[PDB]
Amino acid sequence: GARKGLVDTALRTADSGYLTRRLVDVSQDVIIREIDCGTTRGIPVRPMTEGSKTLIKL
DNA sequence: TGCATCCGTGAAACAGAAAAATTTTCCTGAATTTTGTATAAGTAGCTACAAAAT
Structure with a gap:
């Protein structure tokens, strides 16, 4: 692994x-x-809410 | 014609020659000091001198 990580x-x-x-x-x-x-x-907005997981408190 | 490949990106020759150059010489020439040299007064000195303060 570690190598891979490295060269990356x-x-x-x-x-x-x-x-x-x-x-x-x-x-x-x-x-x-x-x-x-x-x-x-303008534009609207809304919390980002993949699944009930809401990523971002509006 | 979408689909090949397929550009090309961002990461040892010489001797003989001569002729140049150059370059030392000169010289010279003139140009350029210095000094001589006048120069010309004015002089600033300087040297007595005189009356009147130690």
Whole structure:
């Protein structure tokens, strides 16, 4: 096991860093620019509730 | 035509030559001090001198 665990590690290290690096690239400059905005629509929410297990107190 | 493969990504030659270069020489030339040298007064000195304070 332990080996497996190891070599893995040695990898998913990058894999992450990699991401962000994308993420940040794609999501790089949504900067708050502006209080005016407008609109009154949004979106709903509800606790996350796999099975009666409710993951997240709303 | 979805389905092959399949690009290519993110992770030792020489001798004889010559001609160059270069480079030491020169020289020189001039340019550039210094000094001589005047220079010319004015001088600031300086040296007596005089009356009047130790």
